Every structure is written in structure tokens, then in C-alpha cells.
RNA sequence: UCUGAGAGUUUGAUCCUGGCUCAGGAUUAACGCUGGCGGCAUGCCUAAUACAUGCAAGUCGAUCGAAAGUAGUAAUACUUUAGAGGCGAACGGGUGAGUAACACGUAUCCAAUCUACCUUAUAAUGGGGGAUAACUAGUUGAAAGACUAGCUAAUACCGCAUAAGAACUUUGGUUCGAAUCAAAGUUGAAAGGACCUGCAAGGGUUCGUUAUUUGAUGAGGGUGCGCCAUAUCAGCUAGUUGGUGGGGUAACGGCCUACCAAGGCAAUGACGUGUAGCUAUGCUGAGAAGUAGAAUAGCCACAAUGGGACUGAGACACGGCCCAUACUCCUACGGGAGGCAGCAGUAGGGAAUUUUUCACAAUGAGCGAAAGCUUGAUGGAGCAAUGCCGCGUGAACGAUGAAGGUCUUUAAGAUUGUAAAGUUCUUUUAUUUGGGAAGAAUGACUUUAGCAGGUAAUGGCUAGAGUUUGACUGUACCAUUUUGAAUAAGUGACGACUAACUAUGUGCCAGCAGUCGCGGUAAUACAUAGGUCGCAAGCGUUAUCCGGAUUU
């Protein structure tokens, strides 16, 4: 690559209503403030949709947002909106070298911010902490400067004060250097300079007497000049704060309002200041296909890997698939190498976006994102190669589609077509499961929740022009039946040109623990030892329909008593069909139950949703105890039907603002009441 | 021209140099392999006066040949 | 394949040593029956009008090692010849390289004589050869300029001569040309060549 | 479009307006012959025809055509 | 003399009428398993289905005025052309929807044709005018542009002198609808540019002009033959069948018009129908023939669709135009712009048919004395076992036959298997080092020798000159060029046809299946292990053309 120092790239990653679009605008905005053409012209006079924050968002620009800032260039990238769905979270994040979590404003909770933290620091990428939102009733700063410590306890340091509170918005009291005020309610034009207010020097001097303090872990000359008194040079300590943030020992956080546009420019200064560059970010090392398959890392010089995150179809040259080209120097014409498939991919031409556009750059550097056309094979979750070499791949997605919910074709040719919409709709994020039943029928396909399933919908009937009806999840049951009784089967009959007859007689009697089970009781020469075995599949094949809703009947054990061969008129399949007759006899006299599908789940919460689970399981059906008192957590198992998992993840999640998780496994068929009895039949 | 990849031939001809090639020919004059040179043709230079009696000027680099062949000894100075 | 592999297990079934004899008679023993578990007496049970086409067939390309499409390019070329097409062919079926290299005295299996001309130390007319398909003509003449002093097995042809009438050869020189087209009575007489070519009109 | 069919444009539309001009006179020129037969309109027609057969505006075989027919038919008056 | 091989198959059985199947080839081949590579090509047949993007056919300043900019004190020289004027554009490439007929091919006829640029052949290459292009200024809008008024150049446009020669008119002179001559009547010929020379006068070179006669080329027109099936398609036909005059096409021609009539064709099949680009030819057979008209080559039709015209020698013009249709795109919404059956690339389809790759190195085509410019043609190169040809994955010796395993069924033996182990050797290819091409025996370029009418001299030409041209290519390959067995073999069948069976499981079920047919209790027919055999980086499967089938 060039100048690796420079290529520090970032992710905007935004909170669930939180101005994910306007948030997103504002970005692109500020990162659009380059005066070569207009684009912060431009940008500042865009005014587009209001249908969903992450939507609107992610379709106001591209995937891929370059830009440059006075020395480096900047790739910014949205792909995830969502629920916050872990997978294009984490593949960003692996695609980015650093981050923006925006808070929540409009209330205090911002459950799902915690949720990107975790999984941003479980990477060991670093990131920076920005409210979204100064103006908006709710936005208190110490409501939110005490609950990052509540919640998380991160050590994150405030370095800038606001002026106002959600009214009286009008400025920053910088901590790096004299206050900056901001007359501007949008469109961030110009800053106005202006000294420190004095009723607030203290509530700096304290601060500041902590911000050098809060890098005194990295020196003892700093801590001599603490006890001096002596003041540490700014540059110093802004350098040990970019340490700090880079190494993830504290991170900082700043204020502002999207809707009013107030101190972004500073937030910029502070990336181009701290943020990292590929040289100081860790090495997240990847892993190739041979049992130990990596002693490596990416050495950023010309290695070529880079992996292949995502594609999109532009209607003119067909796909696009964007990567971000961890190392190595690559250009087009060239036949790349993918170990995964085996398989050879031209490079027609390279292509950079920065909000819309297309820059053909013919080669491109190590640390850098842009998109393809050619490569018409690839998908998502592989690491493209030159060198003829394995590739080594890096990945841990997080796959949770808790809810599936049943997709009804029309027609077999509408199966064919929803089919192809599968595979067009598998290439971007194949966490979702597809399931046809060989009983049920339905076609089974996972989400995520309500704006999964949305969305899906969305691209099935808009993006993908599929029309198909949308159902509900198929796993119905299994059959038994009650106590023993014996009857005889005699089938004296012929189709198609001669006699046949046959006869036996046979015990059908429940087992409770095992299937099928077959006893002889021939002593008198009643049934030849031929006849044995035949009867005993006329049995296996005659429980396969229940009288009630036609289940195959299981847990039965068969003693076959008697019989009677007679002459040519005898054969085989006319005893196994006098079977048959009998067993169905039987089936129909011994008063026939159903089994339900049980599954097992485990719910592990601190302390919030203990009544509400109880409650729910209570009403909605289950089977439960007591407690479990697990280190600082409740634990609850409970042996629930599987149909009562239809909205559960959704009544769960809501009641617990997307904060809750379960793990979901199959226990047993345990028998239906009543109620059952009477739902699913006709 | 024909022959193969690494491999060309042009078989010579007094061919109009406004109409196209690789087609019907009132006469072919020669042939040469272009790739070695050693200047192998089956000129004719019989019918070949006639056809520049009659115009019917080759292509581009024949005049060489041409010099070879002599004809400016005996058509241009054929009046004096 | 360019290979039959193991070569002794080819006189197995046939019955017959691609050598003179010494092939499978003297490397222990001497195993000539054909090869399977599953065998037993058989003496008039496999042996058809059909199946000795295919052996003569079989054991023709095998003294040459000649594959299906080059098999049809020389009953081609023989074709592109008259009279007596089957001794004519027999004639040809002499012009290989590595053939004619073991029958020179330069190469005591054919075998060697093809990985040799493989390995580039022949020189077949200011030309080194690396196919050792090529044809033969009279009045060809050959070097082995320096790839044979490291190689034991062309000097121990060399002393182990052969006497052709159809080639000359320097063997202390390191010398051979091809002089005249050989005679059949040189040659293996078990073979029939008649009925091969009946057995090509299938194109 | 491309930049050399406007230029061939730009020129043919200017010459077939001329051509149109040469064209029309020489037709009125056959009217008046058509109204009534005289020397003076047959050696007007005679230059119309050098005029215009000299260029491309009118082909050497329709001229020769129309000034025999004309000259055929006064043969008789 | 070119030149010919079948097999099984009903039934108690035998043949016969006679069907079937494959053994054989071919294929834009497709698919499976796999797969280093050389060289030879080729590589949408589905949807003339819809397409972003780029080139896709432009050139000339020594044709013209002038503009812009450099140098120069200025003049002027130079660099580029916004434009005009000249020419190429109709070449060429691609497609096969249409078209079942002069369309191909073929033999001839055009007493009825034309055909710049290029052949022959001569007459000269003037006198002017008056205009606009470009530009300037204004009007309308973001702009593309559009509109208005002023100035002019051109080898541009249009009169004016003569027309050598022709052509027309008339008279005389020809030939089996003809052709040739003489005189007279009439008409209309050019334009200049550059260079050398010359005080000048003027002369010359060279380009171009005009008209003239003659090649060739291409096009048009005439027919004969050859150029699918359909009668479970027998009447069609009123510009229809001809005649007179006129218009008309490069010419003839109801091609068309006015008048005059009512014929003309068609059972040897018109018309209607569907199926179609045609040929040389690719493949299949010995052939009569069949197969299809790959690619290429020749010819014809088309350029989003229907017309219509436009100049131009030549077009109703891939990539000129208008209308109308249908679509798409932009519009700050008033209006505009366009047509990949061009190169690719892209979307769909299918089983699938590839690079928006390079240089114009060569060839070619165009423009131009000249240099020079265009050239998605062209030549290459990328990719694909797609076909063809060619090569390796070792080789010399090497054991009563290493170890294990298999059968034999504990016993020996065989068996895997010279395969192994072992010694020795090697390197096309894998891979380091230097060599290393012709392709350009062309083309430019001026001075020389010479030729040549002139000569005052440049220039017109032939023999040598190097500064001149390589993507391909420090390429293939080669001196053990470095090391090194190292960098590498699968596939099908094994009851018979059809050269290829043992052990186990197995129970008309599982399944094989080209056919005969197998498997219901130890199956040489299935499934596995081992073994055998045949082809091989190809082997298996499918479709379809033929041989076999002489089985219309």
C-alpha cells in the first residue's frame, strides 16, 4: 500500500431510533465537506424521505462513503440497519478500523447501544462515544455520563461541555482548547472562537485536573508534574488520550445535536487527531482450511486479502461486489483466485463511491474499501486471493433468526420462483434458514423479527419482483393411542384377474417407551415362518395414518397370535393387508391421542423480567418449578409446547426492549389437552 | 491473409486497392510468407502489365515487389 | 497412458516376454500365468477369433507403446503408402525413436531410450528431440554431446551392442544412422498385421 | 448523431437548395416549351442542359432523353 | 479396378414377412468424475430479448478566409483549427426475422444499359460578379441551443469568350433492330494552389480543373437449367392479359398514365399453407446419396418498426434525415436526445458458449505531392480438455517375490507384484542464470550515381545510406543454465454379445437395465472389498446426422 498512516477507516454505527438517518445524513455531511466540487454545498442541500431511520439512512448514500479530511482519506460505511442483526455488525466492524456509537436521546434506555458496545469491544477495535441528540427533551448530560458508568463502567471520559439544555443549545465549551460557540440550528457552516466562559474555568480545571490525570497510567513525568502543578503541553496530552482510545484503556465522549448540526467539525478533528490507522489497530488474523492453517497476519505491503463482505447488482453492469482489501496492492483485468470454490473471478474494473458516484481507480492499495464489476461467482463471508494460495478467513458471525415464520407459493412454479428469490436473497446474509418439510409442506424461512420479515418481504416483492402469500410456522405433531386390545384381520379379496385371501390376528398393545415390537405367538402351525416377517412391515406401514388428524401412530408393541395360509388363494400382501385392516381396527376401537412437539428453553435475566416470563409461561402454556439462583442471575427452564414459541420471541423482546436471549432445544412429545384436541382439526 | 497463429501467409495479388480482399479475383499474382523473410513468390508479371495497363494498383507495400519484378524498366519508360 | 506400468504383469496374461525371454524369467522365478484371483483352468474358455485379434492388437502397441489417436495417424501415414500394406506398416512400426535407440545399442529397454529422449540427450539432426514419437528416414545422424558420460545405462548398451543391417552405428562413438528400411524376417513373426487393418475402416 | 454528418448537413442541405433552384428553371423552361414551339426556348434549353449535365445535378442520359424528344417533336414544325 | 466384415432377438423348434437394440463414426457438442502443459483453431445454436460505458469511419492549412497562442521592436514564421471547401462515407463488419423466388450457382444475352476516385487519348486551364461561412453585438434560459441586424474568403456559388473533341438537328454515305463517315444548325470549356526559376518578361515542376476517347470495376436488366413439403389445398386473375400515344428509369419495360379491348395462367399442381437465407461445402457411407448449409469464402435481404424523400458516381445509408409508431433517458419541465442484427461488456434464458484486453508492431482501408491523421478492421495476446495433434507423472538393474491385505477358505502356495524395498542415474516439463530471433528482403528521407522533355532550377523516376517501425517477446527453446524422483492418473466394463470375476451382504425386496433379462434364501447379473481387462487427461452419460438398414 501507500502511506497505510492515512487510511484510517470508520464505521457509523447508530442506535434503533436514535436519527439513524439523520444521524447518517449529518456524516455524510460533514464528510462530505470538501470544496473541491460542492459537495458540502451539496450536501447541505439534500432534504430526502422520513420512512425508517435505518432505511432512509443506509439509501440517502452508498455502502461505501469515501471521503477525504486535510491529510487522510476516510472511508465511512452503513451497512448495518436493524434490530441491530449481529452479522453485518460485526462484518463491518471487521471491514472498519474504527468506530461511532451514537447514543440514545430521545429517551435514557438506549438498550441496543450497549448491545453494539459489546460486540465493538469484543473485537478490541477502538471507538468513540457521541450523543446524537443535545436538543431533544430527555437528552440530560449527567443522565448520561452516570448511566455509560451504571450500565457498563467503561471509564469514559467527557471531554466537552455544551451550553444549554435541549432549548438553549447554542455552543461547546471545548476542553482541548477555548470554547467554541455555535449560533447555527443546521447545516454547520462556521464556528465561532471564543474564550472560556468564566463561571465554568473550574469545571474545567477539575476536569482538567482529572484528563491529565486520566492518562497519568501511561507515565510517571506526567504524575511529577501533577504533584508540580506544571502544566502538560496540550499536544502531549491529546497524544496520550489517542493512546489511551486506540488501546482501548478509556474512550472519550462528545456532544452535539443532529437535528441542529452543533460540534460535529470537532468530532472530525478529534477522528483525524486519535482515531487509529491501520499501523495502530491490532491484527485480526484470519484462518485457512488445513488444520492449523495460519502462522500470519495481513503485513499490509503486497499480500493480497481482502474479504468478500457484500454484493449488489447495479442493472447496467450486473454485480457489484464491494471489499474492503485488508492487504496486498491489487488492479483489474486479473484473475483472482477464491480457495473456497475453486474458482477464477476477472476483475473487470475496480470502482470507488463516495456518496452516489462511481471513481474508476485502476488500482487499489492496501486499507482501502471499492467494488468490483466482474466476479460474478463470489458471495459474502470469503476472503478473496491472487496468489493461487488458500485463503484465510476470518469469521465469528452471530447467527440468532429466533422466529421463523412459514412462506406460502401460490403454485409449485411460485415454490420455483420463491427458490430463486432464496437464492438471490442467500448471497447477501444466508443466516436465515429454509426448511421444506416433508410432512408439513410449508416452506420454513427464519428472521430476525418484525422488520427482518419486513424487509425480506420487501426485497421478495419490490427487489426481487416475487409475489408469494405468507403464512404461519409448520410442525404439527405425533400420534399414539390408549390401552391394549386384540382384533383379527381377514381380507378375502381380488384386483385384477384370480382369488386372493388372507387372515391373521394380532394384539395391539401400547409401549410406552419403545416403537415398534413384534411377539409371535404361532405354536399350532397357524403361520409359517415365511408369513413372519411380512405381517410385521404391514404393521410398520399401516400406523402411518391416525383417524383423527392422520399422524403415524408410534410407542405400540404388536404379539401376533394367529393366522390361517390357505391355498394358491393365500399370499403374502393379502396377510400383510388383513394386518392392516386390523391395526386400523384397533387404532379406531382403542381411542387414538396426539403428542405436541416440547421444546426446552432457558431464560437467564438479572432481575427485570422475572414476573413477566412467569406470567407468560403461566398464560400462554409451559411447564415450570420454582427458580434457579445462578451467580448474580434467575435462571428458568421450562418444558413448553413448540407452538408457543409463535410471537414469544417477539413478546419476550419487547417486554425487554430487545435486551433478552434463550436457547431453544427439543425435549419430548408429551400429550395434548383438550384445547389441542380441539384447535388443529377441521 | 491466411496460414495460422505464429504462422502467416499472404498469397499475392494484383487485387483493386479499393475493393476488400479474401474474395473473388480476376488474377492472383504470387504469394508470400511474411513471418521469415526470404522472398519465395510465384510472380507472374505476364497478365500482371495488363492489369496495370489497366490500373488495378495492389496493395500497399507491392510496389517493392515491383521494383523487384523490374516493370518500372519496362512500364513507366515505355514511351519514350 | 504413455506407461503400461508394470510391464511384467503385460506378459502375465500374455503369456509372452516383451524381452527376448528375460523379461519375467529371471527375476526369482519365472511367473508366466496370467493374473487374477479369480484363476483356474482355462485352456479353450477365453480364446476366440475376436479375442487373438486383440491380443496381436494388444501386444502390438505394446512393443511400441503407441496411443489410439497416434495408432490412427500411422495406419494413416501407412495408408498414405501402397502395396503390401500390413508389411509396409511393419516397416513403419520400426520408425520409432526410442525403438530404434534400444535396437542401436544405445538404450537397453525402449522404455529408457523414451525417457531419455524426454530427457533431452539425444539429438536427432541438430535438433534435439524431447517426443520420441518422431519418424525415421534413412541417412539421419545423432549426438549425445555431453549428457552421457553421467549415464551409466547408455554405456553399458554401447558395450552390449546390437547387429542391424538396416542401421549403422558407432556404439564407441556414440554414433547411429538409420540406413535402410529392415526386413520382416529381423522382426517377431507372431504377430499379424493383416487383420489390425481390417479392424480400422471405422472412421 | 456524429460531428461529420452535421458538417455533410451543413453542405448538401445549401447544394440541394441550389440544385432544387437549377432544377425548378430548367422545368419552367420545358413549360414554356410545352406552351409554344420556337427556336429561342429550344436554345435555351440547350444551355440549361450543359448548365446542369455538367455537375451531378442532372445525369448525361436524362438530358440527351428530354432535348431529343423536345427536338423530335419540333422536327415536324 | 474405385471399392462392401455385423451381433443378438418371438417359439416345442425351424426359418420366413418383418420390427427392435447396439457394436462405428460424427457433434458450435452438453453433463459427471477428474485434470500440468505444448502446438492448431474455434469458442450464442435460446431472446431481430432489453441494454450503461468506450471506441465503433474519418481526413486534408501546400483548398479557403480568418480566428486563437508563441517567437519576433513590427512585418512575418510557427503551433492548433471554430468554420467553410474536397474526398471518404454505399468500404467494411454483424445478423438471418423476413424472403419458397432469377435467389443461389450456372451458360449465355444485353440489335436495350449505366458505371467519380484508377487506364488510354487530346483540347486548354480565362473574364468577372455577388454572396455567405467564421465572427461581432442584442433577445430568450443554468445550459445546450434557437432567433435578430453588420463585415467579408474560397480550387465554394452563379453569369460572361471560345469551345479542340463529343452530342443533338438536317442532308449525303452504312448493317441484317443494327453501325460507321462527311457537311451544315445549335449549345455549352476550366480555378486556381504550392514549389523552382526568372530583375522582370516569362519558363518549368507539381497538384487540380474542364470536355473529350477508351479500359477495368460494380450495378441494373433477359432467360434455361438446378434450387422444401403440402390436392384431408382446383380455379386464380381485372394493371389482371396485350395493343396505341405520352410521362418515366443509367436503358427496356403497365413501371405508370390517357385510350382500346378481354384475355392470361392452372391438373406437367397455380394459389393457399407451414417449413427456409442460398452455394462452395462440414460430417456419414464405396457410391448412387443422406446430413446440415458450422466458421470461412461468394451472393442476396436488414439496420428498433412502415413509409418517404436528401445529396452524392454509388444508399432510401449499422453507427445520414423527417414523419408516425413503440421504448428509454434528461429536463431547474419549457422542451429535447437516441437507437450494439459493430467491438466487447451487461441483464434474462438455457447445460452452456469467453476480454468493455493490447499495438495499430505487420497487413489492409480511407484522407493528404509531402509529412502526417483515422483504423473495437487488422494482427496479437486472456480465458475454456471444446475439438485436433503432442508430451509427463521416472528410468538401469533390482525377490521363489519386502510388509500388510486378498483368495486359497488354519495348511502351502499364489496374490497384490519389478509393483515394493535397495543401489545408481537423469531433468523436456517445476524451477535460477545468460543467449534469443526473422517477423520491417517493407514503409518512409534528403543528398549522390544515373535516366528523363525541359534546363534557369527544384522537382518526375531506378540502385546504396540511417536516424526509421515489436504489442507479441529477455518469448518459445537452449549451454547439468540452480536444485531435484523430484512438480502430477483417472475412468468404464467384468452372465452373454463383449477380450474382464473371486470373497461377503442380500432376499422379485433392495436394484442393475443397450437387448436377451437377472434378484423371492449360498446372485460369477444386484450392493461393497479385492482382483482382472480396455481407453486415458480423458474416460463415463444424454441429445441429434449417418453407416450398419439395400429396412420407401
Request: with cysteine; charged share 30%; glycine share 8%.
Amino acid at each position: 500500500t501507500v502511506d497505510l498512516i492515512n487510511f484510517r477507516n470508520f464505521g457509523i454505527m447508530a442506535h434503533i431510533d436514535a436519527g439513524k438517518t439523520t444521524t447518517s445524513e449529518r456524516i455524510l455531511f460533514h464528510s462530505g465537506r470538501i470544496h473541491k466540487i460542492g459537495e458540502t454545498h451539496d450536501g447541505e442541500s439534500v432534504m430526502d424521505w422520513m420512512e425508517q431511520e435505518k432505511e432512509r439512512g443506509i439509501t440517502i448514500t452508498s455502502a461505501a462513503t469515501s471521503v477525504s479530511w486535510k491529510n487522510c482519506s476516510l472511508n465511512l460505511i452503513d451497512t448495518p440497519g436493524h434490530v441491530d442483526f449481529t452479522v453485518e455488525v460485526e462484518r463491518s466492524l471487521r471491514v472498519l478500523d474504527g468506530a461511532i456509537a451514537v447514543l440514545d436521546a430521545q429517551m435514557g434506555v438506549e438498550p441496543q447501544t450497549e448491545t453494539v458496545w459489546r460486540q465493538a469491544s469484543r473485537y478490541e477495535v477502538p471507538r468513540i462515544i457521541f450523543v446524537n441528540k443535545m436538543d431533544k427533551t430527555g437528552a440530560n448530560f449527567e443522565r448520561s455520563v452516570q448511566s455509560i458508568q451504571q450500565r457498563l463502567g467503561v471509564k469514559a471520559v467527557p471531554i466537552q461541555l455544551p451550553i444549554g439544555a435541549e432549548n438553549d443549545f447554542n455552543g461547546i465549551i471545548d476542553l482541548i482548547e477555548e470554547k467554541v460557540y455555535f449560533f447555527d440550528g443546521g447545516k454547520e457552516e462556521k464556528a465561532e472562537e471564543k474564550p472560556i466562559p468564566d463561571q465554568f474555568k473550574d469545571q474545567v480545571k477539575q476536569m482538567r485536573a482529572h484528563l491529565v490525570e486520566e492518562v497519568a497510567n501511561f507515565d510517571d513525568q506526567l504524575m511529577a508534574d501533577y504533584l508540580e502543578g506544571k502544566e502538560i503541553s496540550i499536544a502531549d496530552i491529546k497524544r496520550c488520550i489517542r493512546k489511551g482510545v486506540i488501546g482501548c484503556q478509556f474512550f472519550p465522549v462528545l456532544c452535539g445535536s443532529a437535528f441542529k448540526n452543533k460540534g460535529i467539525k470537532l468530532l472530525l478533528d478529534a477522528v483525524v487527531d486519535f482515531l487509529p490507522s491501520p499501523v495502530d489497530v491490532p491484527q485480526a488474523k484470519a484462518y485457512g482450511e488445513d488444520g492449523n492453517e495460519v502462522l500470519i497476519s495481513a503485513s499490509d505491503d503486497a499480500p493480497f486479502v481482502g474479504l468478500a463482505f457484500k454484493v449488489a447488482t447495479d442493472p447496467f453492469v450486473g454485480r457489484l461486489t464491494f471489499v474492503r482489501v485488508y492487504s496486498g496492492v491489487l488492479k483489474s483485468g486479473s484473475y483472482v483466485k477464491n480457495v473456497r470454490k475453486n474458482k477464477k473471478e476477472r476483475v473487470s474494473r475496480l470502482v470507488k463511491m463516495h456518496a452516489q458516484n462511481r471513481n474508476e481507480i485502476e488500482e487499489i492499495r492496501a486499507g482501502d474499501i471499492c467494488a468490483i464489476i466482474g466476479l460474478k461467482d463470489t458471495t459474502t463471508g470469503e476472503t478473496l486471493v491472487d496468489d493461487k494460495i488458500d485463503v484465510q478467513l476470518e469469521a465469528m458471525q452471530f447467527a440468532q433468526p429466533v422466529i421463523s415464520l412459514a412462506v406460502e407459493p401460490k403454485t409449485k412454479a411460485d415454490q420455483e420462483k420463491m427458490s430463486i428469490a432464496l437464492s438471490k436473497l442467500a448471497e447477501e446474509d444466508p443466516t436465515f434458514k429454509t426448511f421444506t418439510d416433508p410432512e408439513t409442506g410449508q416452506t420454513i424461512i427464519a428472521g430476525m423479527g418484525e422488520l427482518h420479515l419486513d424487509i425480506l418481504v420487501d426485497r421478495m416483492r419490490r427487489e426481487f419482483k416475487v409475489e408469494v402469500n405468507v403464512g404461519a410456522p409448520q410442525v404439527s405433531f405425533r400420534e399414539t393411542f390408549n390401552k391394549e386390545s386384540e382384533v383379527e384381520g381377514k381380507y378375502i379379496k381380488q384386483s385384477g384377474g384370480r382369488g386372493q385371501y388372507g387372515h391373521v390376528k394380532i394384539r395391539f398393545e401400547p409401549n410406552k417407551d419403545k416403537g415398534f415390537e413384534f411377539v409371535d405367538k404361532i405354536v399350532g402351525g397357524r403361520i409359517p415362518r415365511e408369513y413372519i416377517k411380512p405381517v410385521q412391515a404391514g404393521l410398520e406401514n399401516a400406523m402411518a395414518s391416525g383417524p383423527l388428524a392422520g399422524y403415524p401412530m408410534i410407542d405400540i408393541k404388536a404379539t401376533l397370535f394367529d393366522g390361517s395360509f390357505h391355498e394358491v388363494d393365500s399370499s403374502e400382501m393379502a396377510f400383510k393387508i388383513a394386518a392392516s385392516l386390523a391395526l386400523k381396527e384397533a387404532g379406531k376401537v382403542c381411542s387414538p391421542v396426539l403428542l405436541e412437539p416440547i421444546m426446552a428453553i432457558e431464560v437467564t435475566v438479572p432481575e427485570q423480567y422475572f414476573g413477566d416470563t412467569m406470567g407468560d409461561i403461566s398464560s400462554r402454556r409451559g411447564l415450570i418449578e420454582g427458580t434457579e439462583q445462578r451467580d448474580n442471575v434467575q435462571v428458568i427452564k421450562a418444558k413448553v409446547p413448540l407452538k408457543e414459541m409463535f410471537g414469544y420471541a417477539t413478546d419476550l423482546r419487547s417486554f425487554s426492549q430487545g435486551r433478552g436471549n434463550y436457547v431453544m432445544q427439543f425435549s419430548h412429545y408429551a400429550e395434548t389437552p383438550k384445547s389441542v384436541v380441539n384447535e388443529i382439526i377441521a | 491473409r491466411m496460414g495460422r497463429v505464429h504462422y502467416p501467409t499472404y498469397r499475392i495479388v494484383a487485387v483493386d486497392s479499393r475493393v476488400k480482399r479474401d474474395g473473388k479475383y480476376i488474377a492472383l499474382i504470387g504469394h508470400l510468407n511474411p513471418a521469415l523473410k526470404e522472398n519465395k513468390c510465384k510472380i507472374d508479371e505476364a497478365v500482371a502489365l495488363e492489369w496495370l495497363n489497366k490500373g488495378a494498383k495492389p496493395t500497399d507495400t507491392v510496389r517493392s515487389l515491383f521494383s523487384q519484378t523490374g516493370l518500372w524498366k519496362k512500364f513507366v519508360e515505355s514511351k519514350k | 497412458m504413455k506407461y503400461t506400468g508394470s510391464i511384467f504383469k503385460r506378459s502375465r496374461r500374455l503369456g509372452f516376454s516383451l524381452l527376448e525371454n528375460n523379461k519375467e524369467f529371471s527375476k526369482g522365478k519365472k511367473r508366466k500365468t496370467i493374473p487374477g484371483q479369480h484363476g483356474n483352468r482355462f485352456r479353450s474358455s477365453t480364446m476366440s477369433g475376436y479375442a487373438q485379434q486383440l491380443q496381436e492388437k494388444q501386444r502390438m502397441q505394446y512393443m511400441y507403446g503407441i496411443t489410439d489417436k497416434q495408432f490412427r495417424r500411422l495406419f494413416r501415414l501407412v495408408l498414405k503408402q501402397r502395396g503390401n500394406l500390413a508389411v509396409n506398416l511393419f516397416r513403419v512400426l520400426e520408425s520409432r525413436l526410442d525403438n530404434i535407440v534400444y535396437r542401436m545399442g544405445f538404450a537397453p529397454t525402449r522404455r529408457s531410450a523414451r525417457q531419455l529422449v524426454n530427457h533431452g540427450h539425444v539429438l536427432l539432426n541438430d535438433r534435439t528431440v524431447d517426443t520420441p514419437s518422431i519418424i525415421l528416414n534413412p541417412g539421419d545422424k545423432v549426438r549425445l554431446k555431453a549428457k552421457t558420460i553421467k549415464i551409466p545405462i547408455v554405456k553399458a548398451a554401447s558395450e552390449s551392442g546390437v547387429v542391424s543391417p538396416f542401421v549403422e552405428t558407432n556404439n564407441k562413438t556414440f554414433e547411429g544412422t538409420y540406413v535402410r528400411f529392415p526386413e520382416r524376417s529381423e522382426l517377431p513373426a507372431g504377430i499379424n498385421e493383416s487383420y489390425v487393418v481390417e479392424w480400422y475402416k471405422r472412421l | 448523431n456524429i460531428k461529420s454528418n452535421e458538417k455533410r448537413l451543413r453542405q448538401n442541405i445549401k447544394r440541394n437548395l441550389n440544385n432544387k433552384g437549377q432544377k425548378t428553371k430548367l422545368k419552367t423552361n420545358v413549360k414554356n416549351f410545352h406552351k409554344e414551339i420556337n427556336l429561342d426556348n429550344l436554345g435555351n434549353v440547350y444551355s440549361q442542359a450543359d448548365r446542369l449535365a455538367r455537375k451531378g445535378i442532372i445525369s448525361t442520359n436524362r438530358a440527351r432523353r428530354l432535348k431529343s424528344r423536345n427536338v423530335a417533336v419540333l422536327n415536324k414544325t
